Amino acid sequence: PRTVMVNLNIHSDYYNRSTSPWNLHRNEDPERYPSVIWEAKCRHLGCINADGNVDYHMNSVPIQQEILVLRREPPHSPNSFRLEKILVSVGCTCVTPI
Amino acid sequence: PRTVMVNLNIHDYYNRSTSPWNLHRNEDPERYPSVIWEAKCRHLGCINADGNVDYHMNSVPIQQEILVLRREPPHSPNSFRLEKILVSVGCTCVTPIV
Numbered sequence: 001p002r003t004v005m006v007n008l009n010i011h012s013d014y015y016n017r018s019t020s021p022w023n024l025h026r027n028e029d030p031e032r033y034p035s036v037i038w039e040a041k042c043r044h045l046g047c048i049n050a051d052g053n054v055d056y057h058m059n060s061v062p063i064q065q066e067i068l069v070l071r072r073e074p075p076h077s078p079n080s081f082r083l084e085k086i087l088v089s090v091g092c093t094c095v096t097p098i
Numbered sequence: 099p100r101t102v103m104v105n106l107n108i109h110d111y112y113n114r115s116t117s118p119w120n121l122h123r124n125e126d127p128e129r130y131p132s133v134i135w136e137a138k139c140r141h142l143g144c145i146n147a148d149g150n151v152d153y154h155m156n157s158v159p160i161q162q163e164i165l166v167l168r169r170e171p172p173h174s175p176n177s178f179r180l181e182k183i184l185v186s187v188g189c190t191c192v193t194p195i196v
């Protein structure tokens with residue numbers, strides 16, 4: 001139990017040209033801070049080629065990143081949390097299949 | 099002043115990418131997490147089907163806004179303020195603007 005105090009008060013259109021473009025999904029969880037997390041979801045299974053068409057010889061895959069969130073502890077607590085690790089998609093990349 | 103308590107105790111396929119990246123260690127003693135891994139694109143262009151770098155496309159880092167804890171007052175072991183920073187989470191391949 002290393003309890004610390006945190007003051008919660010704090011003081012893109014280029015990725016549309018990507019060969020593995022993605023859309024943003026709003027992920028809401030009332031038991032978490034931040035309650036709203038934007039998760040990227042790849043638009044296509046393949047990648048956009050030179051002609052602007054979807055080529056299935058390449059794959060758009062999401063980039064999964066481990067992020068820290070605050071989980072309310074005990075549940076529904078407005079002022080006490082525990083640090084937690086979750087996996088979120090931050091964008092998409094284009095990979096050459098195996 | 100939205101002060102909350104936080105218990106700090108918590109409970110590569112992207113090598114085949116056309117816009118591959120490496121990880122850079124970013125350290126800050128006045129921040130939690132003190133160590134953040136920032137992605138840095140390996141090439142200016144994108145790896146094509148033949149395995150060669152094509153400069154008609156660009157590898158660009160995907161910048162995401164993340165929350166960190168800044169020690170407040172400075173050097174405080176137990177009190178922080180939430181802070182927004184921009185981090186590179188990976189790289190994508192974009193078709194440049196003409």
Ligand SMILES: Cc1nonc1C(=O)N[C@H](c1nc(Cn2c(=O)n(C)c(=O)c3ccc(Br)cc32)n[nH]1)C1CCCCC1
Binds near residue numbers: 038
């Ligand atoms: C956005 C967002 N949407 O929801 N939550 C968040 C969020 O930013 N949460 C904070 C956070 N998690 C991380 C995880 N992280 C990490 O540990 N290392 C060590 C990394 O190299 C790293 C690299 C890239 C990314 Br991307 C993340 C990385 N960094 N910052 C968290 C909030 C509560 C107080 C403690 C900090």
